[PDB]
Amino acid sequence: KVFGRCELAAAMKRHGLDNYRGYSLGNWVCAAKFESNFNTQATNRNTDGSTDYGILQINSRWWCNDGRTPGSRNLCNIPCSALLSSDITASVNCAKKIVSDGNGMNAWVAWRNRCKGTDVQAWIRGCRL
Ligand SMILES: [Cl-]
Ligand code: NA
């Protein structure tokens, strides 16, 4: 599923990501835009051999099991394929663990380099939330 911008905003709000650990909703929409272009099926291989999965590009080294990453910790206790669903519940649950791990949203490279320090409220402009 390729989400619309406000469609994704409403789903993330439903799941409690608005100001989760202090990160306003626009931060989460911005991250999804630049990590996956709002596409739940996105996958990208990293140089270290791990792969990033789903709308928030959650990484197989630490967070999910994809059967082909040495040393996988699988801390969200899910198969990485579960992150590609049109239902974003699994991705959101796992993202809550990640952002609570100590570095906040800096865990998402695209957030750090493209959202941090910008007017992220623009990502929810026009949305009825
Ligand atoms: Cl933080
Ligand atoms: Na893992």
UniProtKB/Swiss-Prot annotation:
Its EC number(s): 3.2.1.17
Primary location group: secreted
Domain C-type lysozyme: 1-129
Binding site for substrate: 101
Gene3D superfamilies (alphabetical): 1.10.530.10
Listed Pfam families: Lys
Gene Ontology molecular function: any one: lysozyme activity
Domain of life, source organism: Eukaryota
Disulfide feature: 6-127, 30-115, 64-80, 76-94
Keywords annotated in UniProt: Allergen, Antimicrobial, Bacteriolytic enzyme, Disulfide bond, Glycosidase, Hydrolase, Secreted, Signal
UniProt enzyme class: hydrolase
GO terms for cellular component: cytoplasm; endoplasmic reticulum; extracellular space
Tissue: In the egg white and polymorphonuclear leukocytes.
Catalytic activity field: Hydrolysis of (1->4)-beta-linkages between N-acetylmuramic acid and N-acetyl-D-glucosamine residues in a peptidoglycan and between N-acetyl-D-glucosamine residues in chitodextrins
UniProt-listed GO biological process terms: cell wall macromolecule catabolic process; defense response to bacterium; defense response to Gram-negative bacterium; defense response to Gram-positive bacterium; killing of cells of another organism
Subcellular location: Secreted
Residues the record marks as active site: 35, 52
Note: Lysozyme C is capable of both hydrolysis and transglycosylation; it also shows a slight esterase activity. It acts rapidly on both peptide-substituted and unsubstituted peptidoglycan, and slowly on chitin oligosaccharides.
Functional description taken from the UniProt entry: Lysozymes have primarily a bacteriolytic function; those in tissues and body fluids are associated with the monocyte-macrophage system and enhance the activity of immunoagents. Has bacteriolytic activity against M.luteus.
UniProt subunit comment: Monomer.
Annotated family: Belongs to the glycosyl hydrolase 22 family.
Protein name in UniProt: Lysozyme C
Organism of derivation: Gallus gallus (Chicken)
